[PDB]
Amino acid sequence: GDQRFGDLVFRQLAPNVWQHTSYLDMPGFGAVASNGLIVRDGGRVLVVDTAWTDDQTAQILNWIKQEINLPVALAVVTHAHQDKMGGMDALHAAGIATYANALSNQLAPQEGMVAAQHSLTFAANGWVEPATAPNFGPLKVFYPGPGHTSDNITVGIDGTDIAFGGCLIKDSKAKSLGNLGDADTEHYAASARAFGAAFPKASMIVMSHSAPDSRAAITHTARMADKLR
Numbered sequence: 001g002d003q004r005f006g007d008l009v010f011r012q013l014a015p016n017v018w019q020h021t022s023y024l025d026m027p028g029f030g031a032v033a034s035n036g037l038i039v040r041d042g043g044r045v046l047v048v049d050t051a052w053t054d055d056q057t058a059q060i061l062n063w064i065k066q067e068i069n070l071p072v073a074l075a076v077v078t079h080a081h082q083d084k085m086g087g088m089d090a091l092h093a094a095g096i097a098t099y100a101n102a103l104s105n106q107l108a109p110q111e112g113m114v115a116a117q118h119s120l121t122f123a124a125n126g127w128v129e130p131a132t133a134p135n136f137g138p139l140k141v142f143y144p145g146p147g148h149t150s151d152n153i154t155v156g157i158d159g160t161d162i163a164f165g166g167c168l169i170k171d172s173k174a175k176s177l178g179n180l181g182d183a184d185t186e187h188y189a190a191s192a193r194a195f196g197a198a199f200p201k202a203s204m205i206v207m208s209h210s211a212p213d214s215r216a217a218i219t220h221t222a223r224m225a226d227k228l229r
């Protein structure tokens, strides 16, 4: 079940995988949840996405200390919006190595974000260039194409049935795609489908603004995105 820890929520998804959830009271939109991931890989911990704020992200690290008690080797953040990168300074203060799409790091200052320390680059087929993602262990990083944003990336967890779509994917009962302010409306559907095709064995889809779902999250998201064209 859910574990309330301060103002955040943690949920175990698999033996070595937990979802972190944090909230930002956005005026005119209510208190918006955003999810990321925590993965134990042997004697270290890997984080996918910050919380909305530095303080919340420090709380993620506090939860990790109390519930796992192993060092956080790295974090990867999945685009340059506040829900994914708002807590970068907290990661740096903690001495954690940070990674983002090169384009996310380029965009970070104008989006009001602090850039990650390291830039990921991607092959033409979307897979991360391995040299730019050293020591990522089971994290398999994939750029599906522009969709939710131009820079959005996705992460599969090798050895599990989990893939993380970030803010690209919404669940199978969602009425909308969420924040389309920086979206590529022409390419969104194809990018959602490319995410699915990159992680064909993933039966649990995790995403930023819905609870974990089946692969129907991918098909429904793509079908909704068809309407943008």
Ligand SMILES: COC(=O)[C@H](CS)NC(=O)OCc1ccccc1
Residues within 6 Å of the ligand: 026, 029, 032, 081, 082, 083, 084, 167, 178, 179, 180
């Ligand atoms: C500061 O906002 C954010 O970081 C995220 C980035 S994806 N935006 C968000 O969650 O917007 C909430 C929203 C806005 C319009 C329509 C649906 C949801």
Ligand SMILES: [Zn+2]
Residues within 6 Å of the ligand: 079, 081, 148, 149, 167, 179
């Ligand atoms: Zn976003």
Ligand SMILES: [Zn+2]
Residues within 6 Å of the ligand: 034, 081, 083, 167, 179, 208, 209
């Ligand atoms: Zn988001």
